Coordinates of C-alpha atoms in Angstrom, one line a residue:
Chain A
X198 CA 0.0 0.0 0.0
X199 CA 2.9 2.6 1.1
X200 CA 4.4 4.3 -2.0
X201 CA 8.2 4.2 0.1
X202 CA 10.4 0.4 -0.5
X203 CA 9.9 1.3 -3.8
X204 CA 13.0 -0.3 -6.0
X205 CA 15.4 3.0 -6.6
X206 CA 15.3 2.3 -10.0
X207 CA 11.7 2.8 -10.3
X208 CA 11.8 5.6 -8.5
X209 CA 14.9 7.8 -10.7
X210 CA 12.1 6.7 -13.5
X211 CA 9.6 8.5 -11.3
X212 CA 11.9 11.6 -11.0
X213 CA 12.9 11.9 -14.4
X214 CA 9.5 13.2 -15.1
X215 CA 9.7 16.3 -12.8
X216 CA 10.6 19.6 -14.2
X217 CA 14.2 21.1 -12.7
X218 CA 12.0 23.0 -10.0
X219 CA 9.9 20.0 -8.9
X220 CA 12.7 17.8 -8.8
X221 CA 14.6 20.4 -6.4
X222 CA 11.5 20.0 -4.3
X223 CA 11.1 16.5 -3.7
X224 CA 15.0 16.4 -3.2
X225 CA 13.5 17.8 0.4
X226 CA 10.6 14.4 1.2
X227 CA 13.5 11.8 2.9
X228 CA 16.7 11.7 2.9
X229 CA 17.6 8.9 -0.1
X230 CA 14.9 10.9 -2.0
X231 CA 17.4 13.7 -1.3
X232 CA 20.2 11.4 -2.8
X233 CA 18.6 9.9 -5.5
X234 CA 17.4 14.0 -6.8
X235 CA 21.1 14.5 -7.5
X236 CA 21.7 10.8 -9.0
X237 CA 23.8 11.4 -13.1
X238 CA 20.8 10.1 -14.8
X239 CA 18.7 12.4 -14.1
X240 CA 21.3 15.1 -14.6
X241 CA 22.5 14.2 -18.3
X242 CA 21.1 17.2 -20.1
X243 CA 20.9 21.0 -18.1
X244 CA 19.8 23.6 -19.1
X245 CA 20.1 27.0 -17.5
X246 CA 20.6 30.0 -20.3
X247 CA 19.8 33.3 -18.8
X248 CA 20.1 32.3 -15.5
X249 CA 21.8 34.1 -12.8
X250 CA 23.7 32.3 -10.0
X251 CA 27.0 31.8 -8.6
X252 CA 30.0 29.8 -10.0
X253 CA 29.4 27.7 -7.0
X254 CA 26.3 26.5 -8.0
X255 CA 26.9 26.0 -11.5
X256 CA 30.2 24.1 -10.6
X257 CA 28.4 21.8 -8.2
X258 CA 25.9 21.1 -10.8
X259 CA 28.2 20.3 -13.4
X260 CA 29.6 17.6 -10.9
X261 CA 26.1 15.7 -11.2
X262 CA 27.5 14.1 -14.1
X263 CA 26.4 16.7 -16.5
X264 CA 27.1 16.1 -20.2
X265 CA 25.4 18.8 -22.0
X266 CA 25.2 21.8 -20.3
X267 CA 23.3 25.1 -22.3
X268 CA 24.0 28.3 -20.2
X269 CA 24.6 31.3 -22.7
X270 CA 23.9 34.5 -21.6
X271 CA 23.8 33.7 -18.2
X272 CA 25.4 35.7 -15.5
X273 CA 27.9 34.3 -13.1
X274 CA 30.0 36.9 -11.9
X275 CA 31.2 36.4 -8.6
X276 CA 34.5 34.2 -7.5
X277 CA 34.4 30.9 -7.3
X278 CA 34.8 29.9 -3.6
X279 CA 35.1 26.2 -4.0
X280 CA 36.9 23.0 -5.6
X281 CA 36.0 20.5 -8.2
X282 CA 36.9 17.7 -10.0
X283 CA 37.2 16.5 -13.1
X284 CA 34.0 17.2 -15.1
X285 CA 31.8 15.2 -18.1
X286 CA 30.8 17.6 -19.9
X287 CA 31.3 17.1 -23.6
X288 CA 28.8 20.0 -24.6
X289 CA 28.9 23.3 -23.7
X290 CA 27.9 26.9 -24.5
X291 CA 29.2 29.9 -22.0
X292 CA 28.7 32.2 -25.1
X293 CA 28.2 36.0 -24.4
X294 CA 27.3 35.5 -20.6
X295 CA 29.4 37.7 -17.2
X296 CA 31.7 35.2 -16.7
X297 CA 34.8 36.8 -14.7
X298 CA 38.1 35.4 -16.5
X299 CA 38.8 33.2 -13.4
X300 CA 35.6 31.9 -12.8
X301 CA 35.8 30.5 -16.8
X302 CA 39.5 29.3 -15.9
X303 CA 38.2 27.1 -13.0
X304 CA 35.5 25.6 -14.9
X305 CA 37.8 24.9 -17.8
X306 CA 40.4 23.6 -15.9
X307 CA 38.0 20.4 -14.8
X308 CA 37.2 20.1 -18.7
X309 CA 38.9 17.2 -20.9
X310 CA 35.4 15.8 -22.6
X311 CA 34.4 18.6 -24.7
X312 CA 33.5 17.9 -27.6
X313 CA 31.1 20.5 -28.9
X314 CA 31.8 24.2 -27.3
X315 CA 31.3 27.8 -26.9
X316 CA 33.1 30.4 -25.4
X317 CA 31.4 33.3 -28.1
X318 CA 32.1 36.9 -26.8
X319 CA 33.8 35.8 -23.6
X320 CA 37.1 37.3 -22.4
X321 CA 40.1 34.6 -22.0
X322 CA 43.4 34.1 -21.2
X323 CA 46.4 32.3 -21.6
X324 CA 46.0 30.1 -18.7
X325 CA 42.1 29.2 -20.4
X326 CA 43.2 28.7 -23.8
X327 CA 45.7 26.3 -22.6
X328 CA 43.6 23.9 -20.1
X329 CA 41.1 24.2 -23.4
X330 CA 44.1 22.3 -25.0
X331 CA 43.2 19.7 -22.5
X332 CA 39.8 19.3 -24.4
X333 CA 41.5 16.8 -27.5
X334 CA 38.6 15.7 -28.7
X335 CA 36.8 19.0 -29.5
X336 CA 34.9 18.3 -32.8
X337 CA 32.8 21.8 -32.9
X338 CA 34.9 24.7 -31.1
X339 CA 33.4 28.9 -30.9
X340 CA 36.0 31.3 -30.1
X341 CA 34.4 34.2 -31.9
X342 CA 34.7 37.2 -30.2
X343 CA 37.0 36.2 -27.9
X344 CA 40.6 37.5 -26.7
X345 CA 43.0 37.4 -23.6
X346 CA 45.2 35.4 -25.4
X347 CA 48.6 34.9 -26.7
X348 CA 49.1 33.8 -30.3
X349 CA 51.5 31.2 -28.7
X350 CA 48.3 29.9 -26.2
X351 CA 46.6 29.6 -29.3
X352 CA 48.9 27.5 -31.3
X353 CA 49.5 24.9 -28.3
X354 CA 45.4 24.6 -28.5
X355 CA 45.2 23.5 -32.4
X356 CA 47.7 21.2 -32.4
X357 CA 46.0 19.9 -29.5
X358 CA 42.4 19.6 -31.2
X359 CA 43.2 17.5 -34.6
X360 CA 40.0 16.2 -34.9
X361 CA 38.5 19.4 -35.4
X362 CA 35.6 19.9 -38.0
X363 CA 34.2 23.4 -37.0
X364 CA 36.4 26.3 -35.8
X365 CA 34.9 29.5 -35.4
X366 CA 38.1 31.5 -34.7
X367 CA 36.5 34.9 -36.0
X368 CA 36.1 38.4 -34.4
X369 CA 39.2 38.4 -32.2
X370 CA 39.8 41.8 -32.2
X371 CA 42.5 41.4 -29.7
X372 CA 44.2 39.2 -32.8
X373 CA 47.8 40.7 -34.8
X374 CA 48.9 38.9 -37.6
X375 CA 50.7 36.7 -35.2
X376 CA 47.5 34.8 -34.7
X377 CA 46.2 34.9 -37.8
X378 CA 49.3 32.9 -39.2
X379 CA 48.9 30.9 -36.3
X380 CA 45.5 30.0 -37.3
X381 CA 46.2 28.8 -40.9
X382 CA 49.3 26.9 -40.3
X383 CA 47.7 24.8 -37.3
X384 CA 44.1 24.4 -37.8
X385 CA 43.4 20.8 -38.0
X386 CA 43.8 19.2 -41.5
X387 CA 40.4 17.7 -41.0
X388 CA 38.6 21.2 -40.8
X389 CA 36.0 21.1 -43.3
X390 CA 33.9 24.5 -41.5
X391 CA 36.3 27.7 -41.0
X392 CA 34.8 31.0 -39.8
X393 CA 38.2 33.0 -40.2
X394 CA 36.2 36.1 -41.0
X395 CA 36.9 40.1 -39.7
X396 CA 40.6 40.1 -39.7
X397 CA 40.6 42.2 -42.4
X398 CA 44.4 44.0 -43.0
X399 CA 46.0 41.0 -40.6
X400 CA 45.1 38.3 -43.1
X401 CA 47.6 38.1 -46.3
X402 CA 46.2 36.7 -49.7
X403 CA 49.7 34.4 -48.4
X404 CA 47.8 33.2 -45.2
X405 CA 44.9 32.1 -47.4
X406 CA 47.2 30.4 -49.9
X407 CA 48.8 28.4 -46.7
X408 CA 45.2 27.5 -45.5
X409 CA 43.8 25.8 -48.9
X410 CA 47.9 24.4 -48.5
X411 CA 46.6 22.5 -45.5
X412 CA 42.8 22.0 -45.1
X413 CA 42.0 20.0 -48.5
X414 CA 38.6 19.4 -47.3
X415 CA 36.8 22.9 -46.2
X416 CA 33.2 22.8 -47.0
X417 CA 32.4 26.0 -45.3
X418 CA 34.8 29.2 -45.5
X419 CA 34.5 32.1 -44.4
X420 CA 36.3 35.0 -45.2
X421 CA 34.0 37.8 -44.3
X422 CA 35.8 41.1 -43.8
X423 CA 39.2 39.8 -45.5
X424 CA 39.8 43.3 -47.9
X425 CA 43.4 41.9 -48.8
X426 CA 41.3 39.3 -50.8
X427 CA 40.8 40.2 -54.4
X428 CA 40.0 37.9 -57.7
X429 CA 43.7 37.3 -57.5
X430 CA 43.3 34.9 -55.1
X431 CA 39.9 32.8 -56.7
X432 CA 42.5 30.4 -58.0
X433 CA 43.0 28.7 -54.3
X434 CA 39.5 28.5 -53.8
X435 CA 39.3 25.8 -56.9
X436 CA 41.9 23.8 -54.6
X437 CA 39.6 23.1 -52.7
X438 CA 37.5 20.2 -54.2
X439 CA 34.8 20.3 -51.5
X440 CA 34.3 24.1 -51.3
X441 CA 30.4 24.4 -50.5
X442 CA 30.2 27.4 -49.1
X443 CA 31.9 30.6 -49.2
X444 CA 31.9 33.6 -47.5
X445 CA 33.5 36.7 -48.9
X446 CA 31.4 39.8 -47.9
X447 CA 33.0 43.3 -47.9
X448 CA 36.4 41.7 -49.6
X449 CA 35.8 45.3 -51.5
X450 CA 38.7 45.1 -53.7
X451 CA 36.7 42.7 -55.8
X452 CA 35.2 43.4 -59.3
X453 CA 31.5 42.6 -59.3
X454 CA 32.3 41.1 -62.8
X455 CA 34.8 38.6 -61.7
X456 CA 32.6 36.8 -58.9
X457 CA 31.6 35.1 -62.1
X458 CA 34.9 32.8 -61.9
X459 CA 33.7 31.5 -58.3
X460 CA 30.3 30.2 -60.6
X461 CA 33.1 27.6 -62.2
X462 CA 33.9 26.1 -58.4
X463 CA 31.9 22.5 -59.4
X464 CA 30.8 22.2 -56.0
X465 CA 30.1 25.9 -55.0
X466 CA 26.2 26.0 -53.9
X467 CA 25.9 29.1 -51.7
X468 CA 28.2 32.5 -52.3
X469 CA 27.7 35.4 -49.4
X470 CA 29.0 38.7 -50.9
X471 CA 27.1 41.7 -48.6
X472 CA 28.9 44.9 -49.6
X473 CA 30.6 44.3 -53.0
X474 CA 27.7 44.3 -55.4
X475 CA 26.9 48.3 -56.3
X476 CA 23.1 48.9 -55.8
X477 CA 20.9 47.7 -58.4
X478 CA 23.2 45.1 -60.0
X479 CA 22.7 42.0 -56.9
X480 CA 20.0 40.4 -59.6
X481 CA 22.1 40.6 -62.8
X482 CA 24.7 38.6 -60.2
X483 CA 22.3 36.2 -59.3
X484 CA 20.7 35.7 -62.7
X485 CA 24.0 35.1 -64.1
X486 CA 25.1 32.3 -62.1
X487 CA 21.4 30.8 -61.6
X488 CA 23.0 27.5 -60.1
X489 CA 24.8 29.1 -56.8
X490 CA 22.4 31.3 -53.7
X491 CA 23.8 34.7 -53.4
X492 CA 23.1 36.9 -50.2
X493 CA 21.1 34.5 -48.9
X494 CA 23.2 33.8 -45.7
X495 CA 23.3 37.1 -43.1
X496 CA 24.7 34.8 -40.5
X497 CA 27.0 31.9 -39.6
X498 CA 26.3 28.8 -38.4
X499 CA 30.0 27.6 -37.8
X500 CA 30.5 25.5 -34.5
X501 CA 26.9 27.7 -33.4
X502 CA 25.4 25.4 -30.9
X503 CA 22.1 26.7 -31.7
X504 CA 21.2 28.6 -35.0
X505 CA 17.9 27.6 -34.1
X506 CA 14.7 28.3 -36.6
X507 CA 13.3 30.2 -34.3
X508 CA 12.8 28.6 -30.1
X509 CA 15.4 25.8 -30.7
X510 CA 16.4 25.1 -27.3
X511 CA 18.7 22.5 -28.5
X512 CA 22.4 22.6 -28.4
X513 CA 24.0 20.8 -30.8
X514 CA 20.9 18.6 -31.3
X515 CA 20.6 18.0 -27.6
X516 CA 17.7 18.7 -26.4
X517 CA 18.0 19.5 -22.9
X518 CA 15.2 18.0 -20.2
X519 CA 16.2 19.9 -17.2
X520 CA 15.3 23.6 -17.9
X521 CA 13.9 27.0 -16.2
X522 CA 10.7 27.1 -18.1
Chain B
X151 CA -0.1 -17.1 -32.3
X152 CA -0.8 -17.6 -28.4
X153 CA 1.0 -18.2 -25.3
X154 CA 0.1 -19.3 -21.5
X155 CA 1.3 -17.4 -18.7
X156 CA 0.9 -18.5 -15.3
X157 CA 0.4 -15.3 -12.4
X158 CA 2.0 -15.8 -9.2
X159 CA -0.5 -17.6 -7.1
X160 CA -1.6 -19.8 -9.9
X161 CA -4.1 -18.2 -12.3
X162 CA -3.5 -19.0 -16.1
X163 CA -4.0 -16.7 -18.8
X164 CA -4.0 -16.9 -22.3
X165 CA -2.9 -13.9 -24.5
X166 CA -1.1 -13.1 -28.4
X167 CA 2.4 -14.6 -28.5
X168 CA 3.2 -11.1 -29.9
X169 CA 0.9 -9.3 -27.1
X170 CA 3.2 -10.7 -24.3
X171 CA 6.5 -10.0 -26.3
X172 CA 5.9 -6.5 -25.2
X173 CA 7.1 -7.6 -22.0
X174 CA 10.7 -7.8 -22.6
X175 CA 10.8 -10.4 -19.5
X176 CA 8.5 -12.4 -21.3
X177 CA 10.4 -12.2 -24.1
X178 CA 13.5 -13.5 -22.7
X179 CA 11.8 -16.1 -21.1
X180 CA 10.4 -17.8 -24.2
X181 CA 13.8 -17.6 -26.3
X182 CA 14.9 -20.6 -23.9
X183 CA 13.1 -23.0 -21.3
X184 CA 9.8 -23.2 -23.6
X185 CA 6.5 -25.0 -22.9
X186 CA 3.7 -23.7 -21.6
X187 CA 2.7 -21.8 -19.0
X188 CA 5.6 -19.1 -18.7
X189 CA 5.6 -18.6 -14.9
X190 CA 5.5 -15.2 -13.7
X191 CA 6.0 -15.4 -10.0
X192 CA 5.9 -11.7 -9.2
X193 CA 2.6 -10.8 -10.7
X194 CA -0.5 -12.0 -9.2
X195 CA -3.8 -12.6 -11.2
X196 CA -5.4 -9.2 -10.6
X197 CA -2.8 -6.9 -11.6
X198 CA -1.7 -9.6 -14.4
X199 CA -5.1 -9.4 -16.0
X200 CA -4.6 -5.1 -16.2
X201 CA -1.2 -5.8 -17.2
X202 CA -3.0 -7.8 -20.4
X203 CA -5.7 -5.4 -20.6
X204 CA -2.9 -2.4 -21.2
X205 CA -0.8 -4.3 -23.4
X206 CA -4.3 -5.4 -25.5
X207 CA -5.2 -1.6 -26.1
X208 CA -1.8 -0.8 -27.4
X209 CA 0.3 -3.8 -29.1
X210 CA 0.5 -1.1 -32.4
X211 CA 0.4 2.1 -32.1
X212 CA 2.3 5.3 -34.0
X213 CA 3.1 6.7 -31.1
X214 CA 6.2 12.0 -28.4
X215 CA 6.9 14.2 -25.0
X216 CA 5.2 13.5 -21.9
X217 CA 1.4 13.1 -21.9
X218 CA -0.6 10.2 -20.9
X219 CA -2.3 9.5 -24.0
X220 CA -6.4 10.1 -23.1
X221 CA -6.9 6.2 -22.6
X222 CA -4.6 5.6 -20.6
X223 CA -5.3 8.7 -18.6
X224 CA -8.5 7.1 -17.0
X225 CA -7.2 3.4 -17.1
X226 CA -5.2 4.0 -14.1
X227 CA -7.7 6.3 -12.5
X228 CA -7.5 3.1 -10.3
X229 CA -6.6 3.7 -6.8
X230 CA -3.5 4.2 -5.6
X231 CA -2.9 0.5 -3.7
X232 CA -3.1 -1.1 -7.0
X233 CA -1.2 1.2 -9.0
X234 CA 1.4 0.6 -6.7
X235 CA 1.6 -2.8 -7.8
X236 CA 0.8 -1.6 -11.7
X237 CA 3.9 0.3 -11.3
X238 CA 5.6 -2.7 -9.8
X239 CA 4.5 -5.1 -12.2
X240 CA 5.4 -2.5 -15.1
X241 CA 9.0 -2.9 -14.0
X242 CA 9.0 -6.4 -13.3
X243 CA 7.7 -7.6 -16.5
X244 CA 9.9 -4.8 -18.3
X245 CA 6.8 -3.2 -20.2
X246 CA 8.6 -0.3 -21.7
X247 CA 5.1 1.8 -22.4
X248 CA 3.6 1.2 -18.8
X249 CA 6.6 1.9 -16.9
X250 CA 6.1 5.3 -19.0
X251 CA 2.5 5.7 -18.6
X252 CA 2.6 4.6 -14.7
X253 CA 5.5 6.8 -13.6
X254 CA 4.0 9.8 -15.1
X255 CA 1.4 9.6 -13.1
X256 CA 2.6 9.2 -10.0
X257 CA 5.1 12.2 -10.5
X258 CA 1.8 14.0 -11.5
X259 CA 0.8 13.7 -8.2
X260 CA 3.8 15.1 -7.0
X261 CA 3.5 18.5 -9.2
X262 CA 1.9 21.6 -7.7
X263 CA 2.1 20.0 -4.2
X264 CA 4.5 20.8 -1.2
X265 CA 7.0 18.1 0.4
X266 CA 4.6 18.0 3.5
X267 CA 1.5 17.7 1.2
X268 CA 4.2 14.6 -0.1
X269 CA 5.1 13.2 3.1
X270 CA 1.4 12.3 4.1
X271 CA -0.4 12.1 -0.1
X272 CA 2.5 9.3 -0.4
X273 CA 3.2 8.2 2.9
X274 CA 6.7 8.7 3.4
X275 CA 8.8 9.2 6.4
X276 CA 10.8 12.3 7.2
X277 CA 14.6 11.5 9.0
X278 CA 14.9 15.4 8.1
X279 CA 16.5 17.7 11.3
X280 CA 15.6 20.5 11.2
X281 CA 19.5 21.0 11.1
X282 CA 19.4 19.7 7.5
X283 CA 15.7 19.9 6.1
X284 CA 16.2 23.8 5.9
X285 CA 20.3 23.3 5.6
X286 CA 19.3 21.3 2.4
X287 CA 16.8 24.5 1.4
X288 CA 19.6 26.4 1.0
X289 CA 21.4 24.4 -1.6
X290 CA 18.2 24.6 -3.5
X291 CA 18.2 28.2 -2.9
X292 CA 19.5 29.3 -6.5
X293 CA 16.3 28.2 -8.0
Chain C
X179 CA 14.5 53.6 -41.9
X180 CA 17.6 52.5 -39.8
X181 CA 17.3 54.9 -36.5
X182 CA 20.7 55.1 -34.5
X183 CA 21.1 56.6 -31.3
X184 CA 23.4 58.7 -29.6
X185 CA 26.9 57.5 -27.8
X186 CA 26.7 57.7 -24.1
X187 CA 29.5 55.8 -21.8
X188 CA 30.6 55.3 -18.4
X189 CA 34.2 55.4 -17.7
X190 CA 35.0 52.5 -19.9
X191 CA 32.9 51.5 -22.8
X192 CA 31.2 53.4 -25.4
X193 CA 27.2 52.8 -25.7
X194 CA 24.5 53.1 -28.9
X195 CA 21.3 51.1 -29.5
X196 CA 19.6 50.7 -33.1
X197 CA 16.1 50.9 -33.5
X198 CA 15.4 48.3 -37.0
X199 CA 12.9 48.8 -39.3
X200 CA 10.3 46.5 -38.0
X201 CA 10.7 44.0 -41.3
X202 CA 14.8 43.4 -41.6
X203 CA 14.0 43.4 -37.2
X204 CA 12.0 40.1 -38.1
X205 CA 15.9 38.8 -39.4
X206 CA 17.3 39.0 -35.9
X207 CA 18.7 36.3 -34.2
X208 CA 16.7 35.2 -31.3
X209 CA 19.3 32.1 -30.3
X210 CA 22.3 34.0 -30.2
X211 CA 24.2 37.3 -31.3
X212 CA 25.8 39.1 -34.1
X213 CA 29.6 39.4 -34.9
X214 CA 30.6 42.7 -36.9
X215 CA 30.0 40.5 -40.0
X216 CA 26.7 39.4 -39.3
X217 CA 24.9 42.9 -38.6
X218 CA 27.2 44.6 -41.2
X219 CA 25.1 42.0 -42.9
X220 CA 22.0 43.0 -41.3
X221 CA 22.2 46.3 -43.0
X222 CA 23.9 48.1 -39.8
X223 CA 26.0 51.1 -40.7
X224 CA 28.4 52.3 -37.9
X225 CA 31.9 52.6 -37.1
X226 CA 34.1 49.1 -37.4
X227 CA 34.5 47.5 -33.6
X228 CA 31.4 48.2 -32.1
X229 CA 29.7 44.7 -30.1
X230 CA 26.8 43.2 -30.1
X231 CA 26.7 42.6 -26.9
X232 CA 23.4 41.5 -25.2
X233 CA 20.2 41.3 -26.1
X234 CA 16.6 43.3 -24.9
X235 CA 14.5 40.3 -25.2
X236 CA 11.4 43.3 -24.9
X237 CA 11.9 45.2 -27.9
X238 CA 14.0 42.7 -30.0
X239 CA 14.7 45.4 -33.0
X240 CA 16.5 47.3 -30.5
X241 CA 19.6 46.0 -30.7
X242 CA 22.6 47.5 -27.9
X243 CA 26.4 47.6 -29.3
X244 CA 28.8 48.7 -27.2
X245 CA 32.7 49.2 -27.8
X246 CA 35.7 49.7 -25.4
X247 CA 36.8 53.3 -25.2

């Protein structure tokens, strides 16, 4: 008749049906109840985005076993006060929340799992970028927006992640050439999505020529905000056989008229190019190379946990069951 | 195209072969030791018979989130002593879609309502000081 | 159409909302933010290293930049 001896099993299956809130609550019936509220199961996917609490909280959290945890622009801005260790998280966005540079290193430095993250618009440092290096397995890795950190940090980090497929190194206005270089000569080989965009006077025609040199299999580049980039260059982007994307808007050194070249890129399906096309002309573009999408892009999707088609409160795919409404 | 299963205080029943290979324990069962009945000593007659009645309704279906499709929803507005053993059974006899149904609607029951309005709606104990009930209140504090 | 406000600060960034014509508004991310590229994209015309730094889930074709001074 009594609902307690229930197998624990049974119960976590009970549990996993409560809503974050509700599940805090009955973590207050008996102590077990209490222990079986903060079991791994139940804390697999978290989700907390907007939320405002302290490091503390969100580190003891993450120590539930956590795997995907969605917090962007969320505001932790106090010290952390306490230790942790090692964390599971494998996914993970952080992007454009308070995060106080030391905060972000302690949280990092229990990271080795990631494999899809997002640091976009946060403020790093060496110390950061290098435990990030810890993270080897990174598949899908945001850094746009970012700075704090050393061209040399940055190296030790992408020789570190060679099974990279998205990088979104883009917007680092702390960046100098130094990175830049950095960047093309040790992105992994198995990039096929590059979001080098906004560099604009630190990239060289010569870094892009290094790039295609190295990363045979980019589907997605983009070059957004590259104005060293002119027609001169087109030539590398045929070297790239798989080329599916590319990205070249306000490269304004470029003659409307030779875009047309790009049109012979036997794989090219989509061509961004905001900025370069004089007023009045962007359909005599379009209806001259009927087989590629012009303009049709405003944003990036590169290593974006969520471009989301409106309420996609997935990361990654993941849809997260533990949530704030 | 039919099997015999044998409750725990005796009671045989005769369903679908395919009907009772919803219940993954059943299902194991039958790949080895076979001739009728399959014994099921942790099921008794009465809640075996629901059990068969549930896993009648569905055997197909096309069939999302969390809801308690709207048959369902009144076949276990039985009380709650047998839905304890519904639930029970549900785990015992590995039923994937009655475990779902049966655990929904006992955390249901725990929505909207307060941990005292648990304690006694449940009957459940309470080794909670007073030094840790509100202690634990505070680790919950940042919801 | 594109309205652009006036630069205020504190004693270490540089502040400016846009106000968005209430059609390219309907183009605005509501899952994340823009880099320079993508409101340059937008149809945003200011000075180069202004942020996109937040987001007024109330009014989103407001959208608040910001830039270190």
């Amino acid at each position: 008749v009594s609902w307690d001896s229930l197998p624990d099993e049974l119960l976590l299956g009970i549990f996993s049906c409560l809503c974050l809130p509700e599940l805090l609550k009955v973590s207050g019936v008996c102590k077990r109840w209490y222990r079986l509220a903060s079991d791994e199961s139940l804390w697999q996917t978290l989700d907390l985005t907007g939320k405002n609490l302290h490091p503390d909280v969100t580190g003891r959290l993450l120590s539930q076993g956590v795997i995907a945890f969605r917090c962007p622009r969320s505001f932790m801005d106090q010290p952390l006060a306490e230790h942790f260790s090692p964390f599971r998280v494998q996914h993970m966005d952080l992007s454009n929340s308070v995060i106080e540079v030391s905060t972000l290193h302690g949280i990092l430095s229990q990271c080795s799992k990631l494999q899809n993250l997002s640091l976009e618009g946060l403020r790093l440092s060496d110390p950061i970028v290098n435990t990030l290096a810890k993270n080897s397995n990174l598949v899908r890795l945001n850094l746009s927006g970012c700075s704090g950190f050393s061209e040399f940090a940055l190296q030790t980090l992408l020789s570190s992640c060679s099974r990279l497929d998205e990088l979104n190194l883009s917007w680092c206005f702390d960046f100098t050439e130094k990175h830049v270089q950095v960047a093309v000569a040790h992105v992994s080989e198995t990039i096929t999505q590059l979001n080098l965009s906004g560099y604009r006077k630190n990239l060289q025609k010569s870094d892009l020529s290094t790039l295609v040199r190295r990363c045979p299999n980019l589907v997605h580049l983009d070059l957004s905000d590259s104005v060293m980039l002119k027609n001169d260059c087109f030539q590398e982007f045929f070297q790239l056989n798989y080329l599916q994307h590319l990205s070249l808007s306000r490269c304004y050194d470029i003659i409307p008229e030779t875009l047309l070249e790009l049109g012979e890129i036997p794989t090219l399906k989509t061509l961004q190019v905001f900025g370069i096309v004089p007023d009045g002309t962007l359909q005599l573009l379009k209806e001259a190379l009927p087989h590629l999408q012009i303009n049709c892009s405003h944003f990036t999707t590169i290593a974006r946990p969520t471009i989301g088609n409106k309420k996609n409160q997935e990361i990654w795919g993941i849809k997260c069951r533990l949530t704030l409404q | 195209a039919s099997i015999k299963l044998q409750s725990s205080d005796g009671e045989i029943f005769e369903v679908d072969v395919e009907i009772a290979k919803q219940s993954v324990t059943i299902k194991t069962m039958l790949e080895d030791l076979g001739m009728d009945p399959v014994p099921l000593p942790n099921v008794n007659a009465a809640i075996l018979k629901k059990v068969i009645q549930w896993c009648t309704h569905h055997k197909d279906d096309p069939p999302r989130t969390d809801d308690i499709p709207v048959w369902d929803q009144e076949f276990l507005k039985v009380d709650q002593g047998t839905l304890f053993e519904l639930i029970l059974a549900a785990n015992y006899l590995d039923i994937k879609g009655l475990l779902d149904v049966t655990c929904k609607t006992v955390a249901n029951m725990i929505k909207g309502k307060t941990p005292e309005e648990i304690r006694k709606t449940f009957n459940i104990k309470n080794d909670f000081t007073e030094e840790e009930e509100a202690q634990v209140r505070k680790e919950n504090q940042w919801c | 159409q594109i309205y652009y406000s006036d630069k205020y600060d504190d004693e270490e960034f540089e502040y400016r909302h846009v106000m968005l014509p209430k059609d390219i508004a309907k183009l605005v991310p509501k899952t994340h933010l823009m880099s320079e590229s993508e409101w340059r994209n937008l149809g945003v015309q200011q000075s180069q290293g202004w942020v996109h730094y937040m987001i007024h889930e109330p009014e989103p074709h407001i959208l608040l930049f910001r830039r270190p001074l």
